[PDB]
């Protein structure tokens, strides 16, 4: 219970999964869903398709709080980023806008070997 209408749609993409979090114009999350949030336990959680079902899900549960229009934010690079968006755009919600607000450092913490060899 709440009934919001419009709010935020955070799409957290990665090469490992995609969690989508729908929230009010204050940013206080209303509903969320991952890929594993729908079965899909290991790898499949990354498939673009997973992102689709996620987006849609969170979108449904969102409209349950009476949602209608959203401002989409994206953060990450995953085989489901631009896809999750494809989802939200459709669904039933009104994607007012889209923005890539991924967080990059102006060079600070040494990344894991896994991500080094940068320079």
């Amino acid at each position: 219970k709440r009934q919001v209408a419009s709010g935020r749609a955070y799409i957290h993409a990665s090469y490992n999964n995609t969690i989508v979090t729908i929230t009010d114009p204050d940013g206080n999350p209303i509903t969320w869903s991952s890929g594993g949030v729908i079965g899909y336990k290991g790898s499949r959680k990354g498939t673009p398709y997973a992102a689709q079902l996620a987006a849609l899900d969170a979108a449904k549960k969102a409209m349950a709080y009476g949602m209608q229009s959203v401002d989409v934010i994206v953060r990450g690079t995953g085989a489901g980023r631009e896809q999750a968006i494809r989802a939200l755009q459709a669904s039933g919600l009104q994607v007012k806008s889209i923005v890539d607000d991924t967080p990059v450092p102006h060079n600070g913490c040494r990344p894991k070997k896994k991500f080094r060899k940068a320079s």
Partner: protein, 73 residues
């Protein structure tokens, strides 16, 4: 490539050492606080160099962004 248009061209005589011409500076930034390269700034070694330092000052005086979010996409 990027041959859209240069920032020096669409501009006049300005003091590249002015760390407050918030209006003129904004011109050299991109769709993010990011400072434009030469292919875009249209500036030159010596210039593009002073630009850069100047810009950083403005940024510090809260006059310019360090980074902007990306609309659309």
């Amino acid at each position: 490539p990027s041959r859209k248009a240069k920032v020096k061209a669409t501009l006049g005589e300005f003091d590249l050492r002015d760390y407050r011409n918030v209006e003129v500076l904004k011109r050299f930034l991109s769709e993010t606080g990011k400072i434009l390269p030469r292919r875009r700034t249209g500036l030159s070694g010596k210039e593009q160099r002073i630009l850069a330092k100047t810009i950083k000052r403005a940024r510090i005086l809260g006059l310019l962004p360090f980074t902007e979010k990306l609309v659309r996409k």
